[PDB]
Design an enzyme around this catalytic site. Structure first.
Site, PDB file in Angstrom:
ATOM      1  N   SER A 385       0.808  -1.218   0.000  1.00 50.79           N
ATOM      2  CA  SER A 385       0.000   0.000   0.000  1.00 50.79           C
ATOM      3  C   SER A 385       0.844   1.272   0.000  1.00 50.79           C
ATOM      4  O   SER A 385       0.276   2.367  -0.085  1.00 50.79           O
ATOM      5  CB  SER A 385      -0.976  -0.003   1.182  1.00 50.79           C
ATOM      6  N   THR A 386       2.173   1.153   0.095  1.00 55.80           N
ATOM      7  CA  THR A 386       3.054   2.258  -0.269  1.00 55.80           C
ATOM      8  C   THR A 386       2.720   2.795  -1.649  1.00 55.80           C
ATOM      9  O   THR A 386       2.846   3.995  -1.905  1.00 55.80           O
ATOM     10  CB  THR A 386       4.509   1.787  -0.263  1.00 55.80           C
TER      11      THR A 386
END
Length: 641
Positions: A385-386
C-alpha cells in the site's frame, strides 16, 4: 581433379572439425599410413601428440578459412589454409598451415606431419607453456573502503603426529576444540580423511581475530585469499569466489586453472574485469629444449578495481537493522540515483563460503525456509500500500482525484457491488470522512480502491506506462523488469482495484521501487538508479506532474508528524521526513493462515539528499519496517544532505 579436389576439401574440413571437437582419435584415423612422404607418425602417436600439446595449452575453437586444395603429383594433392584458435594465453590468429593429401584408393587421407600441430613444428620439436597467475582486482565503496579485497588470512590447522598417541592426543583435541570454538567430533573427522598422512598439515578453520594460545599439534599459517570485510552484510550483493574446475576451463581457457572464479553476485558479474589476464609464453623448442619460435607471449595484467556507489557504513547499518529477519533495504541519493545500500536478510557468510564450507553448513543455507541466498533487493514483490502514492499522483495528474473531495467510508470492508461475491477491500482505520490527505495518513486502501475504479483502467495505465514497467535497467544485477500485471489488460474490476493500492499482479523489486519513488525527490522526474560510481546519471522527465508532487509530499510529511500517522514513531528523530508505510497480504500456501509484508518509504523532503525503501517479508506479529528504520535514517540524514 574437380570431384577429387572437392573430396580433398571434405577430408581437410573433417580433419579440422575432429580437432575442433577434441576427438583426436577420429582426426588421426583420417591420416595416411606411416612412411616417408606419407604420415610421420602412427595413429596412436598422433592422438598422443594432439592430446599432450593441445591439452597443455588448453586449445579450443579451432577455426579455419581461405582453404585451397590443388594437385601436385599424380596421386598427391596439396592443401593450405589460414587458422586461428583459442588458448589459455589468448587468441592465436593468422596461422598458415600446409600439407599434402593422398588418394591411394577410394578414399583420401592426410599426409600427417608435425606442422599440422603448429605451423613451424618439425620432427621432434616440443612445446613449452609458462603461465603467471593474475591478481584479482578489488571491489570498493564510494569512499575507497574495501568490500572485496585480497587479504592475508590466518589458517588454523593440526599435524596428526604432533598431537600425540593416546590420552595425550584426546586431551589436545579437547584443548583445540575449546580454544577455537570447534567440534571435537569434527576435528577427528578432519584428521582421519583418506588424504591425510601423519606429518601433513590438516587445515581446520580461518581465525579472524587475534590468535589464542596454541596447544600441541595446532599451528597457524598465513595464506592469501579473498576477504570480505562486511561479511553477511553485503554477501548477496558482492557474492563470493570459488575454486576453478576442469569444466570452468573447458568453457573459457583464458581462466587460470589455478585461480578463483566469481560464483555469485558482483564477483561473478564483473569476473572478466576483476580477474585480469594470465601472463606467460607459449613457445616451440628444439629436440633438446632450446627455444625456436614464440607463438604467444605477454606479461600478466592484474585485475582492474571496481568502485561502487555503496556506502560501507550505510550497508552495514541497513543490514543490521533487519535483525536477521527476512527483508531488504535500499538506500539512494534520489537526485543522482547512487545506490548507497543494498541489504538483504537473512544472509550467508561469504568468508566461510570461499574458505571451504562443510556439506552441513551449505545445506543449512539451502534448507533454511527464509532462503538466505535470495537477493531480496532484486526480487519482484507486490509493492504494497506504499504504492498509493503513485496512484494518487496519477489521479491528480489526470484530474480524477480532487484533493479536497471527501468520500464517505463506513466500516473496514468495502466492495463495489454484489458481483464481487465474498471479496472486499479492507482498511485498518474506521474513519468516516476521508480525503486524500486522510487516506495517505491512515493508509486507507478503500479510499484508493474507489478512486482507481473511478479513474478506470485506461487512465490508470496511461499514468503507469510513464514509469519503468517493462524496462531493463542498466545494472550489473540480475533482475526481471517490473510488471503491471500478467497480461496487457486487467480484465477484472477487482484486479484493477487491488492494483490501485499496490497488490494484484504487480511485481516490482526494491531497486525498481526506489527508482519509481524517486519522482517525489525530483519534481516528477524519474532518476534511474546507478551502482557503478563513474556512470553518468540517467533520468526520465515529466513522469508525474510537478503539481502532484507539491500536493503529495506535504501529506507525506503528515504521515510522520500527525499523531495518527502510520509512521509517527519516526517523529522522535526530529528531522525533516516524508514517509509512507505499506502492507501486503500474500497466500503463503504452507501456513494457509496468511503471510504479511511490511513496507516503509522515506526521504528528506527539504534537501532530497537521501531516500529509503525498506521491506519486511513475512513479518512476525507486532513487527514493522518502520520500527527498524530510525538508525539508518539518522545516518543518511547526517551524511547525505
Amino acid at each position: 581433379e574437380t570431384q577429387a579436389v572437392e573430396a580433398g576439401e571434405k577430408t581437410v574440413e573433417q580433419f579440422v572439425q575432429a580437432l575442433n571437437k577434441g576427438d583426436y582419435n577420429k582426426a588421426a584415423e583420417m591420416t595416411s599410413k606411416k612412411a616417408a612422404n606419407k604420415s610421420a607418425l602412427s595413429e596412436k602417436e598422433i592422438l598422443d601428440k594432439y592430446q599432450n600439446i593441445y591439452g597443455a595449452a588448453d586449445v579450443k575453437g579451432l577455426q579455419i578459412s581461405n582453404l585451397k586444395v590443388d594437385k601436385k603429383d599424380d596421386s598427391t594433392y596439396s592443401f593450405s589454409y589460414k587458422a586461428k584458435m583459442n588458448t589459455s594465453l589468448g587468441e592465436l590468429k593468422d596461422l598458415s598451415y600446409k600439407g599434402t593429401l593422398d588418394r591411394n584408393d577410394g578414399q583420401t587421407t592426410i599426409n600427417w606431419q608435425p606442422n599440422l600441430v603448429f605451423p613451424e613444428m618439425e620432427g621432434n620439436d616440443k612445446v613449452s607453456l609458462t603461465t603467471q597467475e593474475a591478481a584479482r582486482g578489488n571491489i570498493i565503496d564510494r569512499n575507497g573502503e574495501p568490500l572485496a579485497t585480497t587479504g592475508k588470512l590466518k589458517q588454523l590447522g593440526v599435524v596428526p603426529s604432533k598431537l600425540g598417541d593416546g590420552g595425550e592426543k584426546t586431551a589436545n583435541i579437547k584443548a583445540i576444540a575449546s580454544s577455537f570454538d570447534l567440534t571435537e567430533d569434527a576435528i577427528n573427522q578432519a584428521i582421519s580423511q583418506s588424504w591425510v598422512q601423519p606429518d601433513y598439515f590438516v587445515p581446520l578453520k580461518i581465525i579472524d581475530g587475534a590468535t589464542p594460545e596454541l596447544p600441541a599439534g595446532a599451528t597457524i599459517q598465513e595464506v592469501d585469499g579473498r576477504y570480505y570485510p562486511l561479511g553477511e552484510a553485503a554477501a548477496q550483493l558482492i557474492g563470493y569466489v570459488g575454486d576453478i574446475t576442469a569444466e570452468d576451463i573447458d568453457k573459457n581457457p583464458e581462466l587460470s586453472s589455478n585461480g578463483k572464479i566469481g560464483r555469485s553476485g558482483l564477483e561473478m558479474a564483473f569476473d572478466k574485469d576483476l580477474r585480469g589476464t594470465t601472463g606467460g609464453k607459449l613457445s616451440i623448442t628444439d629436440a633438446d629444449g632450446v627455444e625456436k619460435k614464440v607463438l604467444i607471449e605477454h606479461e600478466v595484467q592484474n585485475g582492474k578495481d571496481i568502485k561502487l556507489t555503496i556506502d560501507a557504513k550505510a550497508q552495514k547499518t541497513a543490514f543490521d537493522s533487519l535483525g536477521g529477519k527476512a527483508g531488504s533495504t535500499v538506500a539512494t541519493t534520489p537526485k543522482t540515483g547512487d545506490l548507497l545500500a543494498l541489504a538483504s536478510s537473512p544472509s550467508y557468510d561469504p568468508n566461510k563460503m570461499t574458505n571451504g564450507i562443510s556439506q552441513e553448513d551449505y545445506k543449512a543455507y539451502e534448507e533454511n525456509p527464509e532462503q538466505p541466498f535470495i537477493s531480496r533487493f532484486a526480487t519482484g514483490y507486490a509493492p504494497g500500500s506504499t504504492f498509493k502514492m503513485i496512484t494518487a499522483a496519477i489521479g491528480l495528474d489526470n484530474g480524477t482525484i480532487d484533493p479536497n473531495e471527501v468520500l464517505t467510508i463506513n466500516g473496514l470492508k468495502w466492495q463495489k457491488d454484489s458481483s464481487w461475491g465474498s471479496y472486499q477491500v479492507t482498511r485498518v482505520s474506521d474513519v468516516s470522512q476521508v480525503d486524500l490527505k486522510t487516506a495517505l495518513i491512515y493508509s486507507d486502501n478503500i479510499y484508493m480502491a474507489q478512486e482507481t475504479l473511478k479513474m478506470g483502467e485506461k487512465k490508470f495505465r496511461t499514468g503507469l506506462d510513464k514509469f519503468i514497467f517493462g524496462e531493463d535497467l542498466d545494472l550489473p544485477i540480475s533482475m526481471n523488469p517490473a510488471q503491471i500485471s500478467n497480461e496487457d489488460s486487467f480484465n477484472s474490476d477487482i484486479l484493477l482495484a487491488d492494483t490501485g493500492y499496490g497488490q494484484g499482479e504487480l511485481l516490482i523489486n526494491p531497486i525498481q521501487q526506489a527508482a519509481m519513488y524517486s519522482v517525489f525527490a525530483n519534481n516528477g522526474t524519474l532518476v534511474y538508479p546507478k551502482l557503478i560510481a563513474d556512470k553518468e546519471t540517467k533520468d526520465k522527465k515529466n513522469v508525474i506532474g510537478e503539481t502532484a508532487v507539491q500536493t503529495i509530499v506535504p501529506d507525506l510529511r503528515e504521515v510522520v508528524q500527525d499523531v495518527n500517522g502510520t509512521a509517527h514513531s519516526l517523529s522522535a528523530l526530529g528531522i525533516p521526513l516524508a514517509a509512507k508505510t505499506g502492507t501486503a497480504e500474500i497466500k503463503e500456501k504452507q501456513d494457509v493462515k496468511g503471510k504479511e509484508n511490511s513496507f516503509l518509504f522515506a526521504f528528506n523532503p527539504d534537501n532530497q539528499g537521501y531516500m529509503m525503501v525498506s521491506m519486511l517479508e513475512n513479518k512476525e506479529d507486532d513487527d514493522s519496517a518502520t520500527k527498524r528504520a530510525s538508525e539508518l535514517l539518522q545516518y543518511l540524514n547526517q551524511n547525505y544532505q
